[PDB]
Every structure is written in structure tokens, then in C-alpha cells.
Amino acid sequence: TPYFREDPRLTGFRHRFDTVDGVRLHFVEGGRADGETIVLLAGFPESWYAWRRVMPLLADEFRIVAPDLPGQGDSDRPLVGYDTQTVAATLARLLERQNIARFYLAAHDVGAWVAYPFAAMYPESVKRLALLDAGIPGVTLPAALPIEPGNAWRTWHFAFHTVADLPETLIAGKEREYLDWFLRRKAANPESFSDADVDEYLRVFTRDGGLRAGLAFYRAVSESSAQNRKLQALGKLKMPVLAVSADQGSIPDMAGPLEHVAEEVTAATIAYSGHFIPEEQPQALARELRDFFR
Amino acid sequence: TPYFREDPRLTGFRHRFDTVDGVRLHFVEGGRADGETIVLLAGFPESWYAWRRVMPLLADEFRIVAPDLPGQGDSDRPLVGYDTQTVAATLARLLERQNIARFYLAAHDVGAWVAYPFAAMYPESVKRLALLDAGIPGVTLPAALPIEPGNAWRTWHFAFHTVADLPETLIAGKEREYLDWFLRRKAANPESFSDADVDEYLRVFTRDGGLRAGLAFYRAVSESSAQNRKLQALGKLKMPVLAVSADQGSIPDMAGPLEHVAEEVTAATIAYSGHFIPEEQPQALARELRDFFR
Amino acid sequence: TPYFREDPRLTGFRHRFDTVDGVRLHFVEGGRADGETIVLLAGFPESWYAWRRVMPLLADEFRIVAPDLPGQGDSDRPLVGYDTQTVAATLARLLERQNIARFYLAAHDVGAWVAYPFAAMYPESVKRLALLDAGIPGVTLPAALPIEPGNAWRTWHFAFHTVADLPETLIAGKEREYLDWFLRRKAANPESFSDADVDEYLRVFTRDGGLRAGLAFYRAVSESSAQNRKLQALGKLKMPVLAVSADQGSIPDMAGPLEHVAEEVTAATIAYSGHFIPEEQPQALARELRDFFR
Amino acid sequence: TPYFREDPRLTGFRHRFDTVDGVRLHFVEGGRADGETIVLLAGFPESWYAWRRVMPLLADEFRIVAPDLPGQGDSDRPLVGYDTQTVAATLARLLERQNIARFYLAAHDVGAWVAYPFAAMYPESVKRLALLDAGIPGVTLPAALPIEPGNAWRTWHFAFHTVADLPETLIAGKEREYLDWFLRRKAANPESFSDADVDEYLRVFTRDGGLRAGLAFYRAVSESSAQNRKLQALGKLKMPVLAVSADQGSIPDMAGPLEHVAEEVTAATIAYSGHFIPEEQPQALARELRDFFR
Amino acid sequence: TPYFREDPRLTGFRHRFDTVDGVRLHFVEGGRADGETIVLLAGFPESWYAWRRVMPLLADEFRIVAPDLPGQGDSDRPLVGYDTQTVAATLARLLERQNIARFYLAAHDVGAWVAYPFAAMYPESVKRLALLDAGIPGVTLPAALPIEPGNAWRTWHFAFHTVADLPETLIAGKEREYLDWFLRRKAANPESFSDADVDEYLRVFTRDGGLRAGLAFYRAVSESSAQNRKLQALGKLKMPVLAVSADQGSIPDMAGPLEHVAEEVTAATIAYSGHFIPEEQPQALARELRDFFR
Amino acid sequence: TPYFREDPRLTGFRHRFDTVDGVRLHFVEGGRADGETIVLLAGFPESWYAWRRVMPLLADEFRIVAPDLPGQGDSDRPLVGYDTQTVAATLARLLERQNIARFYLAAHDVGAWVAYPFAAMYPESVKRLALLDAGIPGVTLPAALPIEPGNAWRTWHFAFHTVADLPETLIAGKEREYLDWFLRRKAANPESFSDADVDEYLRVFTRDGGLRAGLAFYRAVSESSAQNRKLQALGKLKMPVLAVSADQGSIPDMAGPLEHVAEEVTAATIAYSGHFIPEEQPQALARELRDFFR
């Protein structure tokens, strides 16, 4: 038996590791043993931990799997392979090895970057797709982003992260301030993140290669964009897509651009939420997901 | 007589200060006493010093005035007023007290941001206008800027600079690294800047309020942008305009968008030059200005 | 439902955030659900927390809302808008969004600076006004302040705070010493502030932009003064005004100068109190407010 | 013979020390040996060195003595005695020991605070008096000073310096930043002070008891004010008084207020000068002094 | 009602502050409400806290008032006035404001410096006087002090403290070492001071102006001596005076020299005690004071 | 021949070392090869270097030997033996090994402490004795030294140095400040010590065991005193003694008390000099020594 550990708080959820062609991946699994499976993907600068408030609310009805993608949380941080097709194929191999054959997929922020090529490459495993307050490189994320005061703070980090070496130079010694700004400035209510939450995100941020790996997603975005444009030309996604917005989120209109990549788009807006919907309005989000994942 | 000081290197040029409504401005003046006047404006993260290699080349024929704008170099750094109309009016006042009634105007980078409303507001004062490798807020600077790796590094700083407090936090203790990145990464040949050149820019960067004032221009960009849009609607620019591009500059096409704002646009591209045309190709730029300023 | 959090100490009071035209504001609300409403404003270098000892004494009978103004406590710190007309308009928008249409207003220190243009601009929303130990820019705060050693310490900070860049330079690394001096030297009994109290004020003083925002109120005092003198010429305040001074406070006579801006001015002096009346004599002040707010 | 040292730059001027009732005082003396004597007094945060540009211009005609007052430059720093009557009496004793019985007196800044009670107590020794850009405590210096941003930076330091212990706490580790602000922000042209000039003022500023003694003059101001009114009520000054203003100086009108303390007041304004007239416009000032000291 | 706080350890004693002509003074009061009053004064480097072990032992019989003198403990630290006649007058004003008209006075170390001019100036208010291990400047304190190694350590700090600026320079960064030496080296048993006791003395030693004000008493000693010689020429003290020695104290003979200044001198020596009698032998000292103040 | 080095500035003087019963002593020798010999002794906190300005003035006529005593300058610092009889014996052994049998002796400060038992023990070897501004332990140095603020700064260090361990603790890291105070505060003109002079004394002060050995002289003063009382009881010094005072020196009357220890005493006062006569008035001192040392 492989070693696993029960979460000290999420009763019934276990921390596991699995090594997938040399890449060790951390994931948390639990929930209803006989239920349909939900797979949850998080983004920057977070990890599986972002779903920690939604997971126990859905556990009564669903089987729940929340992995740390390569370069996230406690998973390994390879040197290359942060184009989203490679990340999705690695996720597919992790799920295959855990005998997760078909599931609902909900993905937030950069996690949604991974979810689009995943759904496009393995449509047979994704029964329904929910994308939360995020653009998709090359198909819905615009090639240019606003610079006018009032909106720039929402997207300034995109272009910054693509610059070589300078982000590492400026963030050094200022890691907690950088994280603190990202999390608390984009929430509707900053108290949605405790000091203990920031501590946890700082742990995986400053841990060997965390910053390098986080930036690598942005630095591979032009390759990921070209991949998605090739995939989009094969046809729109056929499975139902839920475009989940937040009334104070980063994306003004989620459903509109997604109608160009999916045949059936259902729109939902979460009230009283900034960008971090799974942590800010877990109940409201759980409700939409449970209702859509049917 | 006010105190003035001869430049230890630019023979015939003198450093002066004048106080304009409580605001002291540093400027360097020289050249042919009987000549037609050229006024030279520089941008971020520089000062009058950016023109130090062009100024002696034109001194034989023209009378040259190179001021530090408010918030630049050795000029004072007021707390507000960095919308470009207020900066332009402050500049106009300085020129009046120096009995500069009519002149040619060449402006680089954020200096060019000031040059557009100045020429729009004081049409008679500006004989001819040269704008060098810069967008003008709200009229030639697009409302959205590239995020593709490969072009995003040219413009990422716009949105970053608009964010409150985070830039001061990240730049602290890394002022030289930040400045060095701007100068050497955006030049075609980084040896266009000696270590002594960087030392001089660092001196004015780190002096009392240097960073604050530099950031203040970007943080006021929505207001300048609206101001420029308002004057935009009042007619095209009166006087002839030379749109100077650099083949490796920040702006792909300078002449094109300026045709939307001026009656007579003359196009010029400086070869083998990055963003810092006055320092990278002084001789070629001086010739273009010498021929256009007739 | 928005996320809110009960105060662990002020039982029956909840911490909330609301976003007003891009600016997120923190506020604490509680008290008797069917009572009349009192709105409480604090000044420098404090926050809503300065009312923490008065709030439970009035909660039996009044509805109580204590917001952090823009630039205070846990509210956002915009880059501009610290002229008190803009701040009062922002506060008005915040109150409207909570359907607080008519209320009693009590304001201390810089809080009173915002309270005056608020009462002048929205007289129908302010049933009665209480101003605590403060002058009002341009109408009751004198244009010159004392320099004699026995009095100069009460007002020296005013002019200091208007200087660009030097205050940030001198306070850096001495934030606690600066805070400690203000709170404990201006109270009649320095033990009115515990170490945990200073810790709390130090937390919000040192958070992103805390010093910048606190200083911005003083740096905009000339615009705030010009605004108030225009409002004063439209007529004096129409609602009853309570001028509360402290026998050891900063202002020798509150009622006197205020008779020129309000029609019915009632005077009260709290004994055994320095400048921080709500923290130094909370019952005495609660009695005066309870009696006046009828 | 006592040890003395020739100034390496001021030809004909010697640095001397003399002990005056336990207090060692440094002074620079030179100029025409049989000429009439000018005594030069400087203020905060300077020393005899502030007169270094005027002294050689007048040395042809006058014997010139430039002392460091107690608490200034290289003179001792007693613990008490910074009320200006005691400082003036100490200066008288120094001059008596150097056989200087009658002289012209020119005094700048806090030096002028010493000059007024000196002139009032020893009228037979002061042939004529020149006061430069300074108010005199209790007589021409107002009891309250302006606070509008625009003129507040000119006088903010007065009240600050009267505060016990906080100025030492805030200035510690920022001595050069504090000095640099005072000298360069208050001059019409900041290049009137070289780096080596700031270095010299920093040397005497950071030397044992330097800050304590400089601040002590402001802290004794109320005693100094009371002394001066006792003298000012005993009759106007008898000798001619030259009130020297600067067009960009700290004080709007010098001659006006001085007409109440002296029978014969002559007005002079030095053009293109900030507060530091002896360093900023030495030739113009020397001409005014030579012309008046007649 | 003024704010007061019960001492967490001393039953029946309250911490208070009162403002006396601008100077806020901290004091601890308690004991038998209708009992006769004892006022207790401490010296360097201590505070009211030095009496904390004697105070409960006398509280059954006497009303007890233990103030921090100006410059001590949590009392304000004015800039000047540490000549002991001025301190005594400040103490007198504090006692009058508390309606303490006639009382017993027991004073230790520099506190005894204050008590002698107090009793000479206000003989009707001092029923009886106890002076503990201290000389009186100019009157019992010798003009020269020992240099022999075996005893010079008892008094070396006297002359050291009068030196300007050098003490601050040497003690900086060594405050705890300096205090520890004073308290523990002069006690007969160094365990008379716990680490928590040293912590408390360090807190008030290192607070704003603590070292400055502590030294000021010694720096004004020649003014205090001249004052005491004038007072002594008016006649010897008429009330009974108790001269309290310690067998290992700083002063070899208390009673001898005091017979020249007081008419009735009672001698007492406390055994097994160093200089800090109130803390080292509280019960023996309390019995002597009780027997003498009855 | 032993290695010796010529002094780089004092031409004709050589630096030498010799070992005396395990203790290396550094000394400088030069002057008239066939002249009579003067041995020169310096004190705290100096070395032979204190005589560098006197040595060349006498070198034309006299043979001059200026040693570093044990614990001074570049000589060894033994662990014990700082009673002045042991030091004098160590000096005697050095002079014998260099075949200096009879000579004039001039001694300053602690050097004079050594000169007295030397002259008392080896009278045939000392032709004449000159003592410069110093008392002699137990015979001329009083057992108590004055503590008026006006005079305590001259002698406070005696008692301080006798305290175990605290001087090392307080002086650590402040060696230059401590030296600077000693040298420049006791000179009539502090410019008698250059920064290079202070550098030289700081070098030997800070050299390993420098502070320990310097303090050891003061810590042994009581043994030295008892030795000196025994020797004096054997008779007055029989050779002529010159008592050299300074008009601003440490010792008010030198010749007076010396009349009790020597048979014939000549008095001389050097004008315009603080304590450090050899450095402050080298020419005046050279003339007096010259006239007496015949």
C-alpha cells in the first residue's frame, strides 16, 4: 500500500502522491465512494487548497479529486512542459493511473487553461465542463489587455510574468507581499483569506522552484495559444460548458467568447465574489456546480 | 543675475533653474545665440541628459533648450499635476519666462506625451513637431497592449505602473536592476549606455520622490488620455509633424496612427536603433531633425 | 450573502466590506435593529477601532455604523481623491448602498473634516451633527498654527505632513515610534492605549499605502479648504450641531468658530480627556451623544 | 602664542579657538587688520562656513570675524544656555577677549535671533546691524506660522524642533537626508550647495551633540521670546538696521515688522536668491553690506 | 472621572496621571483612606516601582502616594527644569491638586535631592523627613568623590553623568548592561532584582527621553547645589529628620553631615542592605519608617 | 644588528624593540650621538607618539629616547605588573640593556606616575626630573577628585577605569569616539590632533590587549599609591624637579604639592595649552626643557 494521510480538517479526504513518468504529483481525494466524479483544477498563485471550502459541500453526493498540477502546490516542478497540452496530457495520465475514466471537470484561473485542451483532447472523459473567471490562451484570452487605471491592476501580471529574469529579481525578499497583493486585492472581501491561508500559499510559493514554475505557465502562453488554435479548428467542444462569472471578477463577459469554442454554453454569475470564487462564495458555487453536473 | 553653471562636457551649454508657480525646473540651454530654437523633451526613465549626444551636433545652427519636466531629473517633484495638460501648461510658462515664443519641438517617450497637448494648446508657439518612438495616451497609444511573449516585454510596465503601492514595494532595494533592465533591454546595443550613464539615471531615479513622480505620469494616464481625446475632436494638429520610428523601437508604426491627429505627417525610421533613439543614433537623428526643422 | 464576520469582542457587531465605484471600504455595523442610526467617523492615525468603546454603550438604543474612510484602516487606498468633498461623496455612496438614508453623524479629527462637506452637501441625510476636537479646513481650522513650545506639539504635524517625500523618508523604520507618540502624548492618560491597541493601529498604518493615504488628507488640505469656503457661502449648516471639546484636547474653543457655519450650535466639554475623546472618556461622550441624538 | 591654522581656501583667514568661561568657541578671522570690523553670524543648519563666499569679497576693506556660536560648527555644545540672551552674552565675552569693542553686525537665520538681543544689550558696540531673512522670537517672528501647502514647507520645522525626543528619533540614520532637504529645497538654485558643502555641514551636524544643540535653539524659543519683549519694550534699537530680504526667501516682508523695533530701518531685497543669501548671492549681498556698513 | 487602573499586584493601589502646568505626571496611590499620608520618592535608575515592596507593608496604617518625578518612570520628560527647586515645586503642585496638604516624606537617592529643597521651601507641609542613602547637592554631598578602586565604583557615575553627550554615546546599545550593573552590583544580594524587575526598569529607561531626563538631574547639579546653599543659609530644617544608612550602602555616614542642615537628626542603619534599601530590606525599612512617622 | 626602521617623518630617529625579561618594549631613539640623554614618557591614552613634535626640536642638542611603557603603544601588554614600581623597574631594565646609565627624565600624565618611583628608586640615574600636568598616586594625587560639572569632566575617567568589566563593555565598538573625546575635549584647540593622529592612537588602542592594559594602570592605583608613600617616607627626591603646568591643563597647582616630595622644585606654566602639552605647545615646552636640562 502507498502511504496516504487523512486531511486534519477535511474529514474523509486523503492526501496521496503518484509518480507519473518521473513527475511526482500530489492530489487530494475523497467524497462519495459510489458517486459520479468531479475533478477540480486551481490556478495561480494557488493549489488544490483553493477548493478546500467547496470540497466538503459536494462530498455528500460526489466523488471528488483535487490535484496539484505540475508546478503547483506540493507536486514536482519539472524544468519544461508548461505548455498546456503537455500539462493536460500529464493530468490525463495521473487520472488514468487512478482509474478515473469519466468525470465532471471544474477549473479555475490557470486551471481553466489546462481544462480547455484537456476537454478538446479527451472529450470522452469529460461529461461536463465548468470554467471559472478565466480566459483561454489563443481562443478567448485576448492578445491585448487593458491599460487604463481602474482595470489594469486586474491583468498587469500577465505581461510581467512573460519577461525573463526580471520578475524573479523584483519578487525576491518580497514574496509574501506579492502573494498578499494577489490574493487580497482581487477578493470582494479580503478576510476571505486568513493569515493562515496566506501562510499556506506562501509555503508552496517559496518552496523549491515554486516561483519559477508559476511563471513558466505564463512564459509558455504563446505556445499554449498556438496549440489551442489548432485544437479549436477541429471543431467546438461538444460537451456542456458552464461559464462561471463573478460580479466583481476579472472577466466582464465569460459566456460570449466561449460560444466560439463550445456548442452549448450556460452562463452563471456568482454574487458578492471577486476572482477567487471557490474561496469567496463556496456555497453559491457548489450549488451551481451540483445543479449543472447532472 | 541668477546662478548658472557651465556643463563640464557640453561646451557652450549652461545649467539653469527657474521657479514657475512654486515649481522649480532645471534646464540646460546653449547653442547658437542667434539661431532658431529647438526645445527637447525626454521621457522615462531619463532626463534632459538623454539628449546630451544630439545637443552638440545641432549647436552650430540652432539654439537649444533641454528642460527636465516636473518630476524629472533635477526638477522639483510636486505631489499632483501629472496629467499632461497641466505638465504642458507648466512647460509653456517656463518657456514664456525664458522669452521662448516660437520654436521647434522634439520629444521622446513620455516627453512626447507632453508634446501633443502642448502643440494642440499652443499651436502658434510650435513651429514644427517631432515625436520619437512613443505612443500618445488616448490618441495613438492603444487602449489594450500586447501580452504575447516576444512583444509583451516592450509595454508590460504601463499597467504595472498604474497599480498603487505595489511598484514601490517591489522596486525598493532594486532600483539599479530596474533601471538597468529598461535601458539595456530596450536598446539595440546595450553598450549605448556606459556604467556612468546608468549612474546618472540612478542618481535622479533614487533622489527624493524620483520613483513616485515617474510612476505618477502613468497613474494619471486615464486623465491625460481623456484630455487628449477632447482636443483630438477639435481638429488635426496644425503644424507639420515628423513621426520618427526606430526599426527596433517600442512602437511598430509611428507615422500611421499620427495621421489620425495631424494634417501633414512626415515619416522617418532610424536604422539600427532601439527605443532610445537620441542616445543610440544621435548623428542620424540630428540630421533628420536638422533637415526637418527648416 | 456577502461574507461578513462577527467581531470577537464587540458581540453583535459585524465586519463588512462593500465596493463603491472601484474602491473597497471596510465598515463595522451593529446595534439595535429598529433603532435610529448613528454614523461614526474617525481620524488620524486611527480607524473605526477608535469608536470601539463607545459603540457597545450606544448599541442598546441605536443602530451603529462605523466605517473606515478611503485611506483608513482596512479600506482601500486610492491614488487620488483625498479632498474632503470627494471623500464625503464616496462615503455618501457607501451609505446609500446600505440604505442608510437618514442618520445622526458623529465625527472625530479628520473624520470631522469629511463630516462638514458631508453635512453641507446632504443636509437632509444628516439629522444632527456632532464634531469632536477638530478644526475644519478653510472655515474653522486657522490658516496659521502655534509655534510656542507649550502648544506647538499639538499641531506641528499638520505642516510636516504637507511636505512631499520627507515625511516618508523620516518615518520609515520608525512607524511604531511615530504612532506611539501621537496616541500617548496627546491623551490625558497614556494608559488609555494598551500595547495591543497600538499594535492594531500599527497594523493598518504599515499596510500597503497606509502612510501615503494618511498623509494625502493633509496634502490635499488646500483643495479641501477651497471647497469648504464655497460651501460655507451657500448658507450655514441647517441641522443642530454639537461641538464637543476636551479639556486637554487639541482645540481650545470648538463652539466659538463653529457658530459661523451652523445655525444652532450646542457646546459640551469632556473633562479628564485629551484629544482621543472616544477612547479616553467613552461613557461621558456616550452620554452627550445619547442626549443630543434625540 | 595660541595655535591657529590658515584656511586652505580662504587666503588671509585663520581658524582659532578660544575658551570663554569654560565654553570653547571656534571662529574664523581675517581681512584688513586695521579696518573696521564686521562680525558675521549664521544659523541652522549651518556654521561660520555659510559666510565663506562673502568673507573674501569684503576682506579688502574690513576686518572680518565669523564665529561658530555655542552649539554650532566646531564650537562646544554646553547643556544649557541656548536662550538668546545667554548666547549673546557669550558672544560678547568672546569678542571682548579678542579686543573687538565696536563692529558692524550682520546675521542670518538663527544668527539673527542672537543679533537682536545682542544689539539691544550692547548698543555701544554695534555700529550698524544687518538681519537677513529671519524672524526674531517674541518681536517679529509671529506666534503662529502658516500651514497651507505652498508656504508650510518653509516653516514646518519650527514647531517640530520644539518637540522633545521625537526629532532625534526620526532624524537618526537620516541626517544627510535631513540636511540635504533643508539646504537644497530652500535655495533658489540647489547647485548653490555642492556635495562637498553638504559633507561639511553633515560633519558638524553628526558630531557630538550637534543635533541636540541645533534643536536646543528652537526649544528655548519661548524663553528667548520673553527676553526679547522685555528688551523691546525698553526702547527701539538705536543703531541703523538693514532688513535684507530675498525674492524667494522664507520671509515675505522683513522691513515691515522691523520698523517697530528700530528707529531707522533700511530695506533691501536680494534677487534670484532663496533663504541662503550669503551662499546663493554673495556678490550682491557683499555690495549691500559694504554700502550700508559706512 | 479620570481614568485609573488598579495595580495587578499591589492590592488597593491605583495608577493615575495628572497634568501639572503642561507636565503629565504618573503616580501610584493607595493605603488606608483616612490614614496620615506618606509620600515616597525614588532615584536613579528607578521609579515609583522601587517602593513596591514597602508600600503594601505600610498600607494598613498610612495613605501612600508614590509619584514618578518629572523625568522618571512613566511621567513626562520636559526639556528643562531638573534643578531640584523646580522639581520640588512641580511635586508640590501635584500634591496640592490631590489635596495632600501635610504629609510624611521618605526619599531615596536622587529623590532625596528633591526632598531637601522641598522641606526647606514647604516646611509646613512636611511633618517629618526620612532621607535614604544619599547626599544632598551643595549641602551634604562632598565636592570631591573617591578614586580608590575599592570604593570608587560606588560613586563613579556622578561625574560621568555631568559630561555632555559622551554618556549617551557609550550607553547606546548597552542599556540593559548599564542598568544591570547599577541595580545588581550595588545590592548586597543581586537576587533582590529579578529579571522581570530589570525588564521594568529597562522599559522606562529606554522609553522616549528616559536616558536624557535621568542624566539631566546630574547635569543640573551645580544649579541645585547653589539653590541648596541659599536655602541652607535661611536656617536649619525644623521638622524631625531621619537619616537612613545601609551597612553596604553608597554613603558611609548619613547622620553626621545632615546635623549641619537640620535641627533634629535621628540616625538609623539597615543591616544586610546595599544602596537599594526599599527593595533589599523592605520590612526592616518599613518598621523604621513606621516608628519614625508616628 | 637588530632590525630597526627609520621613522618616515622624524629624520634621524629609529624604531627599535628589545625584550626585557620576556616583555617586548618598543621605543624610538635618535638625536645627538654625543649629547646628553633625555628619556621621554607619555601617558593615557597615548604613547611615545605624543612626543613627536618635541623630539626634533631637542635632537640637535640632546640624545633622545622615547619608549612605549608596558601596556602602551606597540609594547607588549603583560597580564599583571601595572603597579608603578614594577613598571619603573621594567623601564630601568630596558635603559640598562641599552646602556643608558644617567639621563634627564621628562614625563607626562601616567608617565609621571612611573617617573616618581623611578626617580625615587634610581636617583643616581636621573640627573633631573620634569613632570608634566599630572598628580602622583598617593603623594600628590588626592584620594578624591572634584565633581562640579565644570570640572568633573576632567577627572571622571579615574573612578570609571577602576570598575571591573563595565568599561570594556561600554567602550566596545565606541573606541574612536572614546579616544576622540579624550584627546580633543582636553586640548585648548582640538585641531592640535589631526584625524591621522587620532588614527594612530586608535591603532594602538584597539591593538590586542590595549584597553585592558590602559585600564590596568588605573586599576592598580591603590597599590601604586602605597608603594609611593613608602618611598617618599625614605626622603625627598634629591635631584632638581621641574613642575610643568598648562594654563588650561588638568591640574590647578602642580608646583605646590610637589614641594613635599622634592628638595628643589622649579615651576613653569605653558600658556595657551590644554592637558596635552607636548602636542599643543611643543616649542614652548622644548625651550623650558632645554633650559632646565643643563
Author numbering:
A (entry chain J), B (entry chain I), C (entry chain G), D (entry chain H), E (entry chain F), F (entry chain E): 16 to 309
Passage from the reporting paper:
In contrast, Cfl2 shows very low activity against a diverse set of epoxides. The H-G-W-P sequence of Cfl1 follows the canonical H-G-X-P motif, whereas Cfl2 substitutes the histidine with an alanine (A-G-F-P). Each assembly is formed by a ring of dimers: a tetrameric ring of dimers in the case of Cfl1, and a pentameric ring in the case of Cfl2. In Cif, the equivalent residue His128 does not form a hydrogen bond with the catalytic water. In contrast to Cfl1, the catalytic side chains of Cfl2 show a much more similar alignment those of Cif (inset). The most striking difference is in the canonical dimer (1:2) interface, which is 1080 ​Å2 larger in Cfl2 than in Cfl1 and has a substantially more favorable predicted binding energy. Given this striking difference, we also analyzed the corresponding Cif and aCif dimer interfaces. We found that the surface area of the canonical dimer interface of Cfl2 is very similar to those of Cif and aCif, albeit with a modestly higher contribution from hydrophobic residues; the Cfl1 dimer interface is markedly smaller than all of the others. Similarly, in Cfl2, the N-terminus of monomer 1 makes several electrostatic interactions with monomer 3 and a hydrophobic interaction between Pro17 and Tyr287 (cluster 1). As a result, within the Cfl1 ring, the three dominant modes include interdimer flexion, seen in the form of new areas of deformation which correspond to its oligomer interfaces that are lacking from the ex circulum Cfl1 dimer (bottom row). This is not the case with Cfl2, where the ex circulum dimer loses its deformability at the dimer interface once it oligomerizes but the oligomer interface deformations do not compensate to the same degree as they do in Cfl1 (bottom row). The lack of substantial Cfl2 activity raises the possibility that it may function as a non-catalytic pseudoenzyme in vivo. However, this is not the case with Cfl2, which maintains the epoxide hydrolase motifs in its amino acid sequence and 3-dimensional arrangement of its catalytic residues.
Here we report the biochemical and structural characteristics of Cfl1 and Cfl2, two Cif-like epoxide hydrolases from Burkholderia cenocepacia. EHs that belong to the α/β hydrolase superfamily of enzymes utilize an Asp-His-Asp/Glu catalytic triad to open the epoxide ring substrate and release the vicinal diol product. Cfl1 and Cfl2 also appear to utilize a Cif-like His-Tyr epoxide ring-opening pair instead of the classical Tyr-Tyr pair. While Cif and aCif exist as constitutive dimers, our hydrodynamic and structural studies revealed that Cfl1 and Cfl2 exist as octamers and decamers, respectively, by forming rings of dimers.
